[PDB]
Amino acid sequence: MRPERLTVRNFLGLKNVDIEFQSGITVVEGPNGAGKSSLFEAISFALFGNGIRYPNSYDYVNRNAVDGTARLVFQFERGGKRYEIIREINALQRKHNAKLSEILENGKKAAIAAKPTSVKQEVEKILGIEHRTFIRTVFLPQGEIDKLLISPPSEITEIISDVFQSKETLEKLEKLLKEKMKKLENEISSGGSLEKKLKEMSDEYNNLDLLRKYLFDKSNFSRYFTGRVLEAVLKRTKAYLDILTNGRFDIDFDDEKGGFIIKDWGIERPARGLSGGERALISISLAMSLAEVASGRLDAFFIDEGFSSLDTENKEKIASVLKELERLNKVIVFITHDREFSEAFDRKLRITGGVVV
Amino acid sequence: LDYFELFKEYLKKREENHEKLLKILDELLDEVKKS
Ligand SMILES: Nc1ncnc2c1ncn2[C@@H]1O[C@H](COP(=O)(O)OP(=O)(O)NP(=O)(O)O)[C@@H](O)[C@H]1O
Ligand SMILES: [Mg+2]
User: Fold this and answer.
1) Which range of residues forms the domain containing residue A33?
2) Does the annotation flag A338 for ligand binding?
3) Which of A15, A36, A336, A339 to mutate to test the pocket of ligand 1 (most atoms within 8 A of CB)?
4) Cα dist. A152→A91, A226, A277, A291, B24 in Å?
5) Do A215 and A300 belong together in one domain?
6) Residue A63 annotated as binding?
7) Which of A192, A225, A258 is where one domain is finished?
8) Structural domain of residue B30, as residue ranges?
9) How far apart are CA A145 and CA A157, in angstroms?
């Protein structure tokens, strides 16, 4: 998922904004209440129909809006195709209109979904992930940088595995498999050639059933695939910890021990036991590792103020490793009110009083 | 990283008669895509 353009009117603290995204790193910088996290949540909402801070969709409308209406336009690329979402949220009338279009080579647009529910479903299908997965992995909200790190084991596995598989495809495959089985059950239910034909059907039924169990029983392939995914992600995460902490900190996953277990010079520690700044540094390393391993699937990496808990030395260390990501064909955005950190990066997007300056 | 590529390896290491099973899988996948 590669963001390309975002237009926002009267959404949260934003009045009117129109931005274009670029590969590499951009730091969104501005004071408290500027509209930085409003931009972050506009993207979340454009895609999935929900933001972060409010459960109620109409609460996202900028209460200063004369017409009581928020408008979002979000353009992004995925898998060599270009898409555009338009949403209008009217808090006065309590209406929420949404549409998803493909932008064809000619530049013309062809709608492929209308209405919030269908737009959401089609975005999930296109992106291959759900909203929770998006915000726990590579699109990290303010105050929630460490949420994946301290999550319970079942949420960790659901989330990390979601990044690397398509539920829609698997859902279709399971339905097709079951329908074939049911058809054979029907046929079987109702000479050399006939004996061979009944056995052919029995064997096919039993083979479909065997395949069904290996593929779809949780304890079989799914468990193994999740393990393969975690191994790849943690291998990279360990490499970052090694660099960032001079060999001190290690990370592993263990369902029985409560999820992510950190070792401090060999001594095991639940992730939640780490200090505030340690959790920020390790969560950023994990997130960075996920973003790298997920290239091609998810081509964005946003962190909304995951930096304030870092002391001077760790902030510098973190900025240095993050800057290495500049070489990647990824849209990378860090949001901060903190000049100490924004100064480490070349390209900036400044926001103040709900507009870009 | 590829889900079905990993599955194929997984199945061959668990099922002596993995040839038939993977044949069926390809047919199913073909239909899902084509559909
Ligand atoms: N529905 C709303 N209508 C109008 N303003 C709102 C609404 N909801 C929140 N705000 C305000 O919008 C402004 C911007 O919020 P936000 O984008 O989160 O700030 P920020 O730039 O991320 N600042 P900070 O995280 O404190 O460094 C704040 O003044 C909010 O209080
Ligand atoms: Mg904020």
Assistant:
1) 1-162+226-357
2) no
3) A36
4) 36, 15, 21, 21, 37
5) no
6) yes
7) A225
8) 3-34
9) 18
